[PDB]
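The following block was generated as part of the benchmark described in Methods. Ligand: mercury (II) ion.
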Amino acid sequence: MKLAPYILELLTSVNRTNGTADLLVPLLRELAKGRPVSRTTLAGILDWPAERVAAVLEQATSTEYDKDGNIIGYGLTLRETSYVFEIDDRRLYAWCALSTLIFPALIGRTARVSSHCAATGAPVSLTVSPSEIQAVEPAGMAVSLVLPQEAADVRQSFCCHVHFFASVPTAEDWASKHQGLEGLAIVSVHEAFGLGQEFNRHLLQTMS
Ligand SMILES: [Br-]
Ligand SMILES: [Hg+2]
């Protein structure tokens, strides 16, 4: 299907203020270590004043902090979700199915992704590298997409509707009882991965 509207509105949704892209990649790479990330650590990696780091994050209202005020969630998260995202020996989580397909390229590492079909509960799993997916089980795994809304919190307007499914027929059946959800579409996990690659290329082309 035509994916330009999805790529466009997702880019808009994340690139609200400049610096977001520049801060995103290091933050994701730090979070992938499996520990909360401090604003000073980001400041040092970025060589920014910590005043700028918090400024960028304040715009990302979805951002999760822990009891110490450190960052534990931004696309990847240490707080449990339906999407398990493992790098090396660390178990992390992701906010949505598309996130699991996008972040391995941004962090430069291969992830073991697992979840459950949103319509049937069947376990699903696959290995996501920066360039390809492997061990897609079951092999006909699908993904739901919706059109991101620009001003809305991305996690509540997009992430919460973007799931894995056992198969495309299963997802479509599920989709038929989810009307009035703008842009709702079912794609193969392969097509969703390609969407993620297009998104990443556009996002990275906007860094310093
Ligand atoms: Br289009
Ligand atoms: Hg997402």
